[PDB]
């Protein structure tokens, strides 16, 4: 039979970076209720850069989801230990897309969630990131393959402006595959 699968809001094909992040073992999916959103445009391997953000999140008490280029090594390990220890309910996922296009999706998620992307080019580093820098969303669901952000707490006007900008780029686009990607 022909089936129809409709996914609303934002959902990108990037699963959790560790199976230990799963909050709900019976479904195998991390479920974060009203979590902070940390959008990093650089690969993360140590915890020193991300430490103050973790302290601020733990003080707030809300969960955290880190959309990053890549989390691995010591930083992933300590995030895992902190997840089980209950100090911070934190999940880490890879940033969707590739070079010159991954940044676009990161900015889209930042606009949707009302956050800011951390990168070397923009100017600020992960050490100086604060709670206001982090994005906000009502719900976050991570599975083995896809991550969904439900009801991101972002300004509607900014979302519409970014959508209009992407539409303008689509009008400027001259490739079917590219225009489908921005669609």
């Amino acid at each position: 039979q022909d089936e129809l699968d409709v996914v609303e809001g934002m959902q990108f094909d990037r699963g959790y970076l560790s199976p230990y992040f799963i909050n709900k073992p019976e479904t195998g999916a991390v479920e974060l209720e009203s979590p902070f959103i940390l959008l990093a445009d650089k690969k993360i391997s140590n915890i020193r850069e991300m430490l103050p953000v973790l302290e601020a999140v733990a003080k707030a008490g809300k969960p955290l989801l880190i959309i990053a280029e890549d989390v691995e090594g010591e930083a992933l390990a300590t995030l895992v230990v902190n997840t089980m220890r209950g100090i911070v309910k934190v999940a880490a996922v890879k940033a969707p897309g590739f070079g010159d296009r991954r940044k676009a999706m990161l900015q889209d998620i930042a606009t949707l969630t009302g956050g800011t992307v951390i990168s070397e080019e923009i100017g600020m580093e992960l050490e100086k990131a604060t709670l206001e820098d982090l994005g906000q969303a009502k719900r976050v669901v991570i599975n083995k393959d896809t991550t969904t952000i439900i009801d991101g707490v972002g300004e509607e006007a900014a979302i519409q402006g970014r959508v209009a900008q992407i539409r303008q780029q689509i009008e400027e686009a001259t490739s079917d595959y590219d225009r489908e990607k921005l669609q």
């Binding site: 140590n46 733990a58 010591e74 300590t78 100090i87």
Partner: protein
Amino acid sequence: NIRPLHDRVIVKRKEVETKSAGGIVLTGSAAAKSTRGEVLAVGNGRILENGEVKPLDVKVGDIVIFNDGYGVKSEKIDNEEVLIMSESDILAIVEA
């Protein structure tokens, strides 16, 4: 008992920090070896070129910040780890 010679000092290394300032648990390379340790034993003192002996400024039982390197040696006494290092390797002493 272990008695260090000349300016050497026997120091028990402090435990590795397993938590951050706000409660973040550090694991692996994040929880590096501590550079501070309490002094377990003090030698007689460094011998100068004139033959005199000058007592070390480090006392027994104080917390000192030292520098790890080739001059620091590891030893096992009462199946616990201690470090033997010269008084020059100790940068400072923690007070209060």
